[PDB]
PDB file of C-alpha atoms in Angstrom:
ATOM      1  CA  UNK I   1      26.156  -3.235   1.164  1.00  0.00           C
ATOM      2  CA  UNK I   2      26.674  -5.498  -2.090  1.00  0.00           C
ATOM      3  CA  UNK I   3      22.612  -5.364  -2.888  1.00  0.00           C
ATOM      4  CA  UNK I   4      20.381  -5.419  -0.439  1.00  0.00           C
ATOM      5  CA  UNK I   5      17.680  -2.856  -0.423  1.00  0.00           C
ATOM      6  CA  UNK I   6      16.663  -3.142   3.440  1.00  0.00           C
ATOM      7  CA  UNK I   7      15.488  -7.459   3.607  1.00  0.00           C
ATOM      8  CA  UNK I   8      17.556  -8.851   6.353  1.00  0.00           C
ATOM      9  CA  UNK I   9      14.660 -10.611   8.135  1.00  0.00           C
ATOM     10  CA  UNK I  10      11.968  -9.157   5.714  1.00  0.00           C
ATOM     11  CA  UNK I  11      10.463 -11.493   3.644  1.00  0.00           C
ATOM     12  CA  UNK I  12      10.342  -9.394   0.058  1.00  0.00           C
ATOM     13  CA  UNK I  13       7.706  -9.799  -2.525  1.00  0.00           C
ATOM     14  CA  UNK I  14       8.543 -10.498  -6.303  1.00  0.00           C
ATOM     15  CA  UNK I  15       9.572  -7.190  -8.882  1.00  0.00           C
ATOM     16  CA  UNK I  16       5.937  -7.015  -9.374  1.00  0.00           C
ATOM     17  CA  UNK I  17       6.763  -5.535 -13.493  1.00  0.00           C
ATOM     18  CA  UNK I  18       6.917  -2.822 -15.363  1.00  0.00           C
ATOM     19  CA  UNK I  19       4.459  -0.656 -12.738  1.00  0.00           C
ATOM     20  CA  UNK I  20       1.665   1.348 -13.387  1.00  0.00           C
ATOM     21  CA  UNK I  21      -0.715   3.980 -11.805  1.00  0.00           C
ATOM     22  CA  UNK I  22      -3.638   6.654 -12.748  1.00  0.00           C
ATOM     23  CA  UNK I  23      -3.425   8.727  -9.486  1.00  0.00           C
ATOM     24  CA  UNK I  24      -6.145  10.882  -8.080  1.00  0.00           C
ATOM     25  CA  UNK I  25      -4.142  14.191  -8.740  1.00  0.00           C
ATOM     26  CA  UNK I  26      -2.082  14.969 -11.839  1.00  0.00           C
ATOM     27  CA  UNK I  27       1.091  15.834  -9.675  1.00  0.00           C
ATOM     28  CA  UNK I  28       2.476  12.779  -8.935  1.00  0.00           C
ATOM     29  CA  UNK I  29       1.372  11.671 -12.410  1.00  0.00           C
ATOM     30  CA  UNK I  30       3.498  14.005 -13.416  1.00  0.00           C
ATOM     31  CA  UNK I  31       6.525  12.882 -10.720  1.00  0.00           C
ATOM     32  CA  UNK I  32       5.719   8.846 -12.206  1.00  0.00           C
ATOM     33  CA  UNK I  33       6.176   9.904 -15.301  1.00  0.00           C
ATOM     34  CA  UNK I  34       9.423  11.959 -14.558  1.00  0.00           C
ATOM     35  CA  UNK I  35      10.530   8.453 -13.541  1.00  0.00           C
ATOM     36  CA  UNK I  36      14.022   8.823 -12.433  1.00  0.00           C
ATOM     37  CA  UNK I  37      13.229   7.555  -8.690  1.00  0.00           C
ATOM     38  CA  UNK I  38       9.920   5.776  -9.708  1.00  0.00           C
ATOM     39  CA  UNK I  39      11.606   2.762  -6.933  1.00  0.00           C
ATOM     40  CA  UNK I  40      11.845  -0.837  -8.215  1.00  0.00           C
ATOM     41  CA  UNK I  41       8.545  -2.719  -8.799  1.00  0.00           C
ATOM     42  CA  UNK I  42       8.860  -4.338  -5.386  1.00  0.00           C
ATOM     43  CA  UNK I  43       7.746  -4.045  -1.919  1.00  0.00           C
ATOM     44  CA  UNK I  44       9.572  -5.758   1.748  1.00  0.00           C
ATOM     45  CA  UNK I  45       6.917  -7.167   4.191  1.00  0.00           C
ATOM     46  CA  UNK I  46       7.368  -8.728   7.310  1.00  0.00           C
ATOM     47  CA  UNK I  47       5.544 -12.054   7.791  1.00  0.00           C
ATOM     48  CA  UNK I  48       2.922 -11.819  10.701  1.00  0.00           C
ATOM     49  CA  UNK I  49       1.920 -14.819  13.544  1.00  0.00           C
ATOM     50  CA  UNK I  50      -1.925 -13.768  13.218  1.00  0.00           C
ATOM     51  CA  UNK I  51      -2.150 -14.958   9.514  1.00  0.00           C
ATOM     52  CA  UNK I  52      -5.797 -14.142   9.369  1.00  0.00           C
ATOM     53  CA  UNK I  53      -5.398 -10.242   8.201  1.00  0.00           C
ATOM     54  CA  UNK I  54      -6.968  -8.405   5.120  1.00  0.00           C
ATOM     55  CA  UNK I  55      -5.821  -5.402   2.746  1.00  0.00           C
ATOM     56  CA  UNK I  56      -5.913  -2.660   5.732  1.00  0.00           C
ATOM     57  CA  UNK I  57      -4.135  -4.655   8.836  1.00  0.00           C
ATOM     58  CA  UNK I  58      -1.593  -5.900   7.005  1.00  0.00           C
ATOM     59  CA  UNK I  59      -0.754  -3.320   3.969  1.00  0.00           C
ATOM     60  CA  UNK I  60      -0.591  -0.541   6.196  1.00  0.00           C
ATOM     61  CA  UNK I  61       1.916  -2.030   8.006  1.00  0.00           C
ATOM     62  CA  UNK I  62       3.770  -3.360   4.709  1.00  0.00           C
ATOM     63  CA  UNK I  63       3.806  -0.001   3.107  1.00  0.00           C
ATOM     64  CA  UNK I  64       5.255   1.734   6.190  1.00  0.00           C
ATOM     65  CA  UNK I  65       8.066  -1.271   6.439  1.00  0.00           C
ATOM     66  CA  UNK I  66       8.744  -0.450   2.491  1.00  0.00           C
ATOM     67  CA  UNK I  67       8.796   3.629   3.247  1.00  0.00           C
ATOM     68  CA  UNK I  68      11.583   3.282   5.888  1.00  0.00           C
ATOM     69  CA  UNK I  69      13.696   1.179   4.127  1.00  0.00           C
ATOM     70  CA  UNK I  70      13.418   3.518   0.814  1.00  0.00           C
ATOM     71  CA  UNK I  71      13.884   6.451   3.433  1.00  0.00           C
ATOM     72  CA  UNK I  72      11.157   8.588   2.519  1.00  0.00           C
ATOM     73  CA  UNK I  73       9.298  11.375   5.096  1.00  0.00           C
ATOM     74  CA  UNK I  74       9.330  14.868   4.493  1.00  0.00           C
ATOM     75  CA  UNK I  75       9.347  15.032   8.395  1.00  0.00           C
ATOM     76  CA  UNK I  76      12.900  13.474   8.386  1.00  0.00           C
ATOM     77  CA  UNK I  77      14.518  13.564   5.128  1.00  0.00           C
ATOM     78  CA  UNK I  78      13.249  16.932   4.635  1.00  0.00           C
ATOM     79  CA  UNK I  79      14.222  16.736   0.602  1.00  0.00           C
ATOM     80  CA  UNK I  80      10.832  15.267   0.071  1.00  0.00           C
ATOM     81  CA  UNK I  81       7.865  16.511  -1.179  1.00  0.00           C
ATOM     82  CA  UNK I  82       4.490  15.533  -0.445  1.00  0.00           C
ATOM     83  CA  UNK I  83       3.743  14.678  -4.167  1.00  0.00           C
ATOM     84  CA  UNK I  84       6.377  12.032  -4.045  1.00  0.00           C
ATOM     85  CA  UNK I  85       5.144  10.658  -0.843  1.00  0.00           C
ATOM     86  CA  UNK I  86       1.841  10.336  -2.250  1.00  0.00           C
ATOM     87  CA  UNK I  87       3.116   8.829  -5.247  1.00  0.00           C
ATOM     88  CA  UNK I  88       4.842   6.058  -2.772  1.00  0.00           C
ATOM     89  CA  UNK I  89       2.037   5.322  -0.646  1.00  0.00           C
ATOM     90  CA  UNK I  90      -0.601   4.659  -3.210  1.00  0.00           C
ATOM     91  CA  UNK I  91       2.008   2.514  -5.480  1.00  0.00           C
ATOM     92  CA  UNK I  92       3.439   0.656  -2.322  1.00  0.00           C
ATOM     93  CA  UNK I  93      -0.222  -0.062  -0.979  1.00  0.00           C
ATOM     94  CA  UNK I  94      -1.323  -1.475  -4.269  1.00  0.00           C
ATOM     95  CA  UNK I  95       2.201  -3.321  -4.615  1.00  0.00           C
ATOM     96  CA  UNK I  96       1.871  -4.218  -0.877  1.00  0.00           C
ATOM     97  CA  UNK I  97      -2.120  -5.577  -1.584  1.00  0.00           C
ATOM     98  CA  UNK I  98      -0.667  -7.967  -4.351  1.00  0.00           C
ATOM     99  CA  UNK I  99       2.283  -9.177  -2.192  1.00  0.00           C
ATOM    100  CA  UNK I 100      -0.402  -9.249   1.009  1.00  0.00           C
ATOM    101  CA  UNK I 101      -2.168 -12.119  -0.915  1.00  0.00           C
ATOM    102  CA  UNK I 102       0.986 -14.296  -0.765  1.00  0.00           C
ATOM    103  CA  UNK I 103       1.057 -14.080   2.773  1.00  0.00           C
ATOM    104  CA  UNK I 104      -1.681 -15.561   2.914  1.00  0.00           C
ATOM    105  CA  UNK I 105      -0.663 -18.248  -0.052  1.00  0.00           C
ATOM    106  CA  UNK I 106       3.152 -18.788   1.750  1.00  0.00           C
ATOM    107  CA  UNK I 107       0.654 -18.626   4.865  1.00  0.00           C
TER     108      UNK I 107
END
């Protein structure tokens, strides 16, 4: 594919910028700050009917559309680790809860 991360009939967010994170457990502090597959500062959601959702309905959804497109489950893939998937759940969530507001702004 010339560039195209997974959208095809997801709507993508904006590269958020220059991403950030504390974490609740030093490892995947430690895997952030290894960088080299830190992912871009983006996110791919699909656009819902309901357009009355909040930061759980929606985002949990979001993050899991985001996670198959970057390929990532140590139950498939079996190269990753479960401090990289916890790095790329809490970073997609709080990517995805930014994005989830222009849903409802795009409406």
């Amino acid at each position: 594919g010339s560039v195209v991360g997974g959208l095809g009939g997801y709507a993508l967010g904006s590269a958020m910028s220059g991403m950030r994170m504390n974490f609740d457990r030093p490892e995947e502090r430690q895997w952030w700050n290894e960088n080299s597959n830190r992912y871009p500062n983006q996110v791919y959601y699909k656009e819902y009917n309901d357009r009355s959702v909040p930061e759980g309905r929606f985002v949990r959804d979001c993050v899991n559309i985001t996670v198959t497109e970057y390929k990532i489950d140590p139950n498939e893939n079996q190269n990753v680790t479960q401090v990289e998937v916890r790095v790329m759940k809490q970073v997609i969530q709080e990517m995805c809860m930014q994005q989830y507001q222009q849903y409802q702004l795009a409406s």
